[PDB]
Design an enzyme around this catalytic site. Structure first.
Site, PDB file in Angstrom:
ATOM      1  N   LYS A  47     -19.062   6.050   7.783  1.00  0.00           N
ATOM      2  CA  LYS A  47     -18.925   5.153   6.942  1.00  0.00           C
ATOM      3  C   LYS A  47     -18.318   4.077   7.527  1.00  0.00           C
ATOM      4  O   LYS A  47     -17.077   4.134   7.982  1.00  0.00           O
ATOM      5  CB  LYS A  47     -18.089   5.726   5.547  1.00  0.00           C
ATOM      6  CG  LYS A  47     -17.931   4.350   4.466  1.00  0.00           C
ATOM      7  N   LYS A  48     -18.829   2.667   7.332  1.00  0.00           N
ATOM      8  CA  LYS A  48     -18.274   1.527   8.208  1.00  0.00           C
ATOM      9  C   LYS A  48     -17.588   0.885   7.382  1.00  0.00           C
ATOM     10  O   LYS A  48     -17.760   0.629   6.097  1.00  0.00           O
ATOM     11  CB  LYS A  48     -19.563   0.971   8.702  1.00  0.00           C
ATOM     12  CG  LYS A  48     -20.463   1.903   9.988  1.00  0.00           C
ATOM     13  CD  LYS A  48     -21.469   0.908  10.534  1.00  0.00           C
ATOM     14  CE  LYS A  48     -22.078   1.529  11.406  1.00  0.00           C
ATOM     15  NZ  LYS A  48     -23.316   0.882  12.054  1.00  0.00           N
ATOM     16  N   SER A  70      -1.981  -3.238  -2.190  1.00  0.00           N
ATOM     17  CA  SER A  70      -2.974  -2.375  -2.462  1.00  0.00           C
ATOM     18  C   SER A  70      -3.485  -2.252  -3.818  1.00  0.00           C
ATOM     19  O   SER A  70      -2.743  -2.598  -4.688  1.00  0.00           O
ATOM     20  CB  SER A  70      -2.589  -1.012  -1.904  1.00  0.00           C
ATOM     21  OG  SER A  70      -3.171   0.407  -2.437  1.00  0.00           O
ATOM     22  N   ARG A 102      -4.706   0.585  -5.199  1.00  0.00           N
ATOM     23  CA  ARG A 102      -4.129   1.751  -5.552  1.00  0.00           C
ATOM     24  C   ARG A 102      -2.679   2.070  -5.898  1.00  0.00           C
ATOM     25  O   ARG A 102      -2.184   2.721  -6.728  1.00  0.00           O
ATOM     26  CB  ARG A 102      -4.501   3.177  -4.646  1.00  0.00           C
ATOM     27  CG  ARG A 102      -6.209   3.380  -4.994  1.00  0.00           C
ATOM     28  CD  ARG A 102      -6.600   4.486  -4.154  1.00  0.00           C
ATOM     29  NE  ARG A 102      -5.618   5.756  -4.574  1.00  0.00           N
ATOM     30  CZ  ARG A 102      -5.875   6.888  -3.774  1.00  0.00           C
ATOM     31  NH1 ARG A 102      -6.674   6.982  -2.646  1.00  0.00           N
ATOM     32  NH2 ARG A 102      -4.960   7.913  -3.985  1.00  0.00           N
ATOM     33  N   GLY A 108      -9.704  -6.144   3.902  1.00  0.00           N
ATOM     34  CA  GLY A 108     -10.945  -5.264   4.528  1.00  0.00           C
ATOM     35  C   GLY A 108     -11.632  -4.711   3.479  1.00  0.00           C
ATOM     36  O   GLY A 108     -11.106  -4.715   2.183  1.00  0.00           O
ATOM     37  N   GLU A 116     -12.658 -12.623  -1.221  1.00  0.00           N
ATOM     38  CA  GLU A 116     -12.522 -11.952  -2.274  1.00  0.00           C
ATOM     39  C   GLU A 116     -11.046 -11.369  -2.671  1.00  0.00           C
ATOM     40  O   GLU A 116     -10.576 -11.439  -3.832  1.00  0.00           O
ATOM     41  CB  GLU A 116     -13.498 -10.696  -2.546  1.00  0.00           C
ATOM     42  CG  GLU A 116     -15.019 -11.064  -2.708  1.00  0.00           C
ATOM     43  CD  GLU A 116     -16.028  -9.939  -2.330  1.00  0.00           C
ATOM     44  OE1 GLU A 116     -15.655  -9.042  -1.858  1.00  0.00           O
ATOM     45  OE2 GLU A 116     -17.180 -10.183  -2.625  1.00  0.00           O
ATOM     46  N   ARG A 162      -3.886  -8.774  -7.616  1.00  0.00           N
ATOM     47  CA  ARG A 162      -3.659  -8.467  -6.161  1.00  0.00           C
ATOM     48  C   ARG A 162      -2.887  -9.751  -5.907  1.00  0.00           C
ATOM     49  O   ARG A 162      -3.387 -10.644  -5.670  1.00  0.00           O
ATOM     50  CB  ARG A 162      -5.085  -8.307  -5.261  1.00  0.00           C
ATOM     51  CG  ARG A 162      -4.589  -7.667  -4.097  1.00  0.00           C
ATOM     52  CD  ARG A 162      -6.021  -7.563  -3.222  1.00  0.00           C
ATOM     53  NE  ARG A 162      -7.149  -6.852  -3.499  1.00  0.00           N
ATOM     54  CZ  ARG A 162      -7.522  -5.786  -3.073  1.00  0.00           C
ATOM     55  NH1 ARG A 162      -6.614  -4.894  -2.305  1.00  0.00           N
ATOM     56  NH2 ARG A 162      -8.497  -5.063  -3.494  1.00  0.00           N
ATOM     57  N   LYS A 209       0.479   2.776   5.677  1.00  0.00           N
ATOM     58  CA  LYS A 209      -0.714   2.355   6.291  1.00  0.00           C
ATOM     59  C   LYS A 209      -0.696   2.535   7.652  1.00  0.00           C
ATOM     60  O   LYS A 209      -0.733   1.497   8.284  1.00  0.00           O
ATOM     61  CB  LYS A 209      -0.855   1.141   5.675  1.00  0.00           C
ATOM     62  CG  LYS A 209      -1.960   1.138   4.443  1.00  0.00           C
ATOM     63  CD  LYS A 209      -3.438   1.946   4.704  1.00  0.00           C
ATOM     64  CE  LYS A 209      -4.028   1.402   3.754  1.00  0.00           C
ATOM     65  NZ  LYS A 209      -5.228   2.396   3.500  1.00  0.00           N
TER      66      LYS A 209
END
Length: 130
Positions: A2-3, A23, A25, A34, A53, A94, A112
């Protein structure tokens, strides 16, 4: 595999200050912006779309810092414009914020660590001027 793409967005060519976003979540935590890449998508195009975005960022895409391994292509980008309202700010509240690289590493280390690893590699490459 998965890229994914990710993008270190800098305030200038000094590459001393990087833009993190919250984040989705964990809304009080910081991450490198990303996302997942579409089928056969160029990672570079995906990076540009994602920072637009997630962070309301427009800028000049730079070098591929490296490929980290599900499998993430990490680019650098020089910010030329920050939009006042952007997709993710409107949709999920966000946030974005400028961090000195070392501060960024500090807030990313705990939850992270892989993102912190991107900036550690950036630092190692800086040391050798590439």
């Amino acid at each position: 595999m998965k890229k994914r793409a990710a993008c270190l967005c800098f305030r200038s060519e000094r590459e001393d200050e990087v833009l993190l976003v919250s984040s989705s979540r964990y809304p009080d935590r910081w991450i490198v912006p990303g996302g997942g890449m579409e089928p056969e998508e160029e990672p570079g195009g995906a990076a540009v779309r994602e920072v637009y975005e997630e962070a309301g960022v427009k800028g000049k895409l730079g070098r591929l810092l490296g490929v980290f391994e599900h499998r993430t292509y990490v680019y650098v980008l020089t910010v030329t414009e920050l939009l006042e309202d952007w997709e993710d700010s409107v949709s999920i509240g966000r946030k974005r914020e400028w961090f000195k690289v070392e501060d960024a590493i500090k807030v990313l280390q705990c939850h992270k660590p892989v993102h912190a690893e991107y900036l550690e590699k950036l630092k190692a490459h800086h040391h050798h001027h590439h």
